[PDB]
Amino acid sequence: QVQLVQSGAEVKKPGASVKVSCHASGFRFTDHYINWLRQAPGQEFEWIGWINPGNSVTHYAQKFQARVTMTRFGSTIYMELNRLRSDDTAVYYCAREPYDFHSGLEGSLDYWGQGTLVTVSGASTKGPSVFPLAPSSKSTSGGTAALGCLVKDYFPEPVTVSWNSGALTSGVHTFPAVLQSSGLYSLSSVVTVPSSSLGTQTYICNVNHKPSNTKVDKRVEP
Amino acid sequence: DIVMTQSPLSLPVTLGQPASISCRSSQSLVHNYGNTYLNWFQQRPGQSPRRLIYKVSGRDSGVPDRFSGGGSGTDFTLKISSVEAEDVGVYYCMQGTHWPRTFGQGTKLEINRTVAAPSVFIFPPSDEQLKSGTASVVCLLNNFYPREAKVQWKVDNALQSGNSQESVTEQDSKDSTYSLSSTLTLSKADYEKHKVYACEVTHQGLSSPVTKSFNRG
């Protein structure tokens, strides 16, 4: 099965460098080369370039030609962007492009990675505080209860939140982050569970803020 | 260097109805042995792109039959015969004839379904948080349509004017609904100055405003 697993979200200061990873599996680089692109939120996709993961022969768009470097080791492809600036904050993607030994690169992308968020900021990073959103009688509806986790005061984005170590995904709503007046983010993740289960099942929010290397497992009790 | 333009930048479509998106290129996308390298990708909320169409009219196994693509030279079209809940997201066109690869601005397929009333919940400040100095009350609106909803914070029947944040999710890939989170934040001092904290919600699926509330004590 084809998988393109990229590295974690990073945060650098202006002028510094960022190196992004893309580990490939399920195919060979013999007949599949690797593209790197990026996407600013409000913008569309910008194409960064491609690499032949065999001989490490590269081809960069002129916009990034001066400060980009694509490399490879084993089944992992790296994309290094130097002299970072404020408008380099975007979600970076790797993508697979099949290769024919006659006619060469097919003009298409078939598989993408999950992408990595890269933000450029001089500000220091800050891990999040995690407070419970406890299920109450004010949280119950049609025999269903809603509980959650409030992730506050972190910088920068993003924070990933799972529930019960990936054993719970149904009814989960992880809301988009909100910027406070402090200059810090804050988001809330919630889930609807059976009310009849509030005394038998265990509900844990797993919070990860990789830019600060912070991991918080909070237990939500009724 | 080969500019791509998409004709409806936003496309409100009711379920079970067809839809079409146009892509226009500044140059001819025909290459070598007559191959026209035009691609159509789909990007659902919070996911990676997924290829729907290759070489103008090619479609992989796994991509639904309701997806088709046509056109020629500098004018192409992606068509969905009957729009479904999972079709929500942003669609892109991408050329592969020349370098650099270029995309369209993207078409936002906004899905329209029956009116859904929101599930209104509320959460009092945590005990761990109160020991820090701040208090955050959370108002939760679950699975409603349309997207337009009003949330009003009431502190002892006093309409609040500037101590809350708000956030709306993207459209759900299964029920085409929305969810909303409001967070009223005060100092532990200002939290302990009042008693009743309420969120009043106004939405088209509610005959009368639903007011959730909790009193300290």
Ligand SMILES: *[C@@H]1O[C@H](CO)[C@@H](O)[C@H](O)[C@H]1NC(C)=O
């Ligand atoms: C959206 O779909 C509903 C369900 O059939 C339909 O009645 C309505 O007219 C559509 N659009 C609007 C503007 O409500």
